Amino acid sequence: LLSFGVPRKAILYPHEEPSWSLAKDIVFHPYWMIFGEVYAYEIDVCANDSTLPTICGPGTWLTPFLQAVYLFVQYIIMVNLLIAFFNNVY
Amino acid sequence: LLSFGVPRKAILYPHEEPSWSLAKDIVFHPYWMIFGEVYAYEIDVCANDSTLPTICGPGTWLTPFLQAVYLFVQYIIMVNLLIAFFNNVY
Numbered sequence: 001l002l003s004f005g006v007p008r009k010a011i012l013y014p015h016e017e018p019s020w021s022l023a024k025d026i027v028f029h030p031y032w033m034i035f036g037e038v039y040a041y042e043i044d045v046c047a048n049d050s051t052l053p054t055i056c057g058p059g060t061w062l063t064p065f066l067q068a069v070y071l072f073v074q075y076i077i078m079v080n081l082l083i084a085f086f087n088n089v090y
Numbered sequence: 091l092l093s094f095g096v097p098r099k100a101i102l103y104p105h106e107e108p109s110w111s112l113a114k115d116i117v118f119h120p121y122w123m124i125f126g127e128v129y130a131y132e133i134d135v136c137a138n139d140s141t142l143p144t145i146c147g148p149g150t151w152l153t154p155f156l157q158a159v160y161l162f163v164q165y166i167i168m169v170n171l172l173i174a175f176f177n178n179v180y
């Protein structure tokens with residue numbers, strides 16, 4: 001989760017000062033991704049259907065690649081390993 | 091994923107020139123479908139609650155049938171096979 005959250009925030013929000021909101025932003029949306037949410041119209045902030053058009057900038061085309069890797073790891077590896085854990089220890 | 095993505099794009103967007111955006115569009119939404127997103131108001135683009143009314147045209151009534159088959163295959167067959175793989179190899 002943190003491996004994803006910290007780059008996502010740093011790439012999309014560079015002009016930020018220190019604040020405790022940084023601690024929420026690196027942890028909040030990545031957690032909710034585990035639970036069926038995708039933030040579809042926040043991926044690819046430079047698209048025409050985007051809800052974050054003010055956030056388009058240099059290097060933002062990276063964040064869809066990052067999130068694709070993130071959810072591959074959490075669901076296809078880690079959620080199913082956890083299912084497999086319980087099935088074999090029940 | 092590609093078996094679905096290529097027809098979906100071709101039927102809904104016919105008047106397109108060559109571009110590398112075609113490589114994103116055949117792969118992007120089908121991937122996010124695996125992870126709990128449905129794009130509910132983009133199915134049946136000719137409906138009244140649709141968010142893509144400019145995309146209604148000849149042959150677009152096919153894309154709900156395609157997506158129904160797609161998700162049947164990915165979740166009910168392929169995600170559960172993968173769960174069954176891990177449970178039996180753990």
Ligand SMILES: CCCCCCCC/C=C/CCCCCCCC(=O)O[C@@H](COC(=O)CCCCCCCCCCCCCCC)COP(=O)([O-])OCC[N+](C)(C)C
Binds near residue numbers: 020023024027
């Ligand atoms: C993994 C590491 C990640 C990083 C974290 C490390 C650092 C941790 C940080 C620690 C200190 C944070 C200090 C915040 C100070 C400023 C807040 C402020 O001004 O008011 C905010 C209140 O915000 C709160 O009341 C936050 C309370 C602390 C958060 C919980 C700490 C973490 C542990 C949890 C343990 C349990 C977890 C679950 C497990 C059981 C008000 O903001 P708002 O109202 O929302 O918005 C403005 C609107 N307004 C006008 C109404 C005001």
Ligand SMILES: CCCCCCCC/C=C/CCCCCCCC(=O)O[C@@H](COC(=O)CCCCCCCCCCCCCCC)COP(=O)([O-])OCC[N+](C)(C)C
Binds near residue numbers: 057068
């Ligand atoms: C399966 C087969 C599918 C088909 C693929 C085959 C072909 C592959 C293609 C390859 C070449 C693509 C060339 C694109 C050139 C144009 C881009 C451009 O103009 O700028 C874009 C940057 O876009 C990029 O920087 C894209 C970077 C390459 C994509 C990754 C390659 C695939 C491998 C990945 C490996 C890892 C995968 C994960 C696994 C670990 C800017 O666009 P934007 O900013 O978003 O929007 C405009 C806004 N603006 C005003 C700010 C500019």
Ligand SMILES: CCCCCCCC/C=C\CCCCCCCC(=O)O[C@@H](COC(=O)CCCCCCCCCCCCCCC)COP(=O)([O-])OCC[N+](C)(C)C
Binds near residue numbers: 061065068091
């Ligand atoms: C070991 C594992 C290897 C995996 C294989 C490799 C994976 C395939 C790799 C890559 C596919 C091709 C990548 C994009 C091609 C270039 C895009 C481009 O030029 O412009 C686009 C930039 O768009 C971006 O920069 C975002 C790139 C898409 C990220 C895809 C992640 C999710 C899907 C991947 C995961 C599922 C993969 C399923 C595989 C079948 C936009 O077009 P434009 O003209 O620049 O601007 C349009 C204007 N607009 C922005 C305002 C609308």
Ligand SMILES: CCCCCCCC/C=C\CCCCCCCC(=O)O[C@@H](COC(=O)CCCCCCCCCCCCCCC)COP(=O)([O-])OCC[N+](C)(C)C
Binds near residue numbers: 056057058059060
């Ligand atoms: C992978 C196999 C090779 C595939 C093909 C080649 C791809 C590979 C390599 C190269 C592609 C990198 C360059 C793409 C530039 C296109 C976008 C552009 O025009 O400008 C970009 C700026 O970007 C920069 O200024 C630098 C960006 C790249 C540096 C970081 C490297 C990340 C990958 C390193 C590791 C990857 C290794 C991963 C291996 C799995 C985007 O910004 P903009 O669009 O100018 O936005 C203007 C916005 N404005 C108007 C508000 C100001």
Ligand SMILES: CCCCCCCC/C=C\CCCCCCCC(=O)O[C@@H](COC(=O)CCCCCCCCCCCCCCC)COP(=O)([O-])OCC[N+](C)(C)C
Binds near residue numbers: 150
């Ligand atoms: C399956 C058992 C049989 C069931 C009953 C019969 C069904 C079976 C057969 C036949 C039904 C096909 C004709 C439907 C036409 C109705 C829509 C219409 O009015 O025009 C259509 C145009 O469409 C065309 O011009 C041609 C469409 C059919 C060709 C492709 C065949 C696909 C299925 C072949 C394989 C299937 C096999 C699958 C087997 C599992 C849609 O366009 P429009 O509405 O005119 O839109 C106007 C928009 N405008 C105003 C912007 C311009």
Ligand SMILES: C[C@@H]1CC[C@@]2(OC1)O[C@H]1C[C@H]3[C@@H]4CC=C5C[C@@H](OCCC(CO)CO)CC[C@]5(C)[C@H]4CC[C@]3(C)[C@H]1[C@@H]2C
Binds near residue numbers: 019020022
């Ligand atoms: C392994 C883990 C990963 C790394 C990590 O944990 C361990 O390392 C920690 C360091 C933290 C920052 C240290 C100092 C400050 C300054 C403070 O300044 C108040 C400014 C204003 C408030 O409104 C009042 O003037 C704001 C918070 C900030 C930037 C921390 C954010 C969280 C960070 C990045 C944490 C991060 C999650």
Ligand SMILES: [Ca+2]
Binds near residue numbers: 036125126
């Ligand atoms: Ca969901």
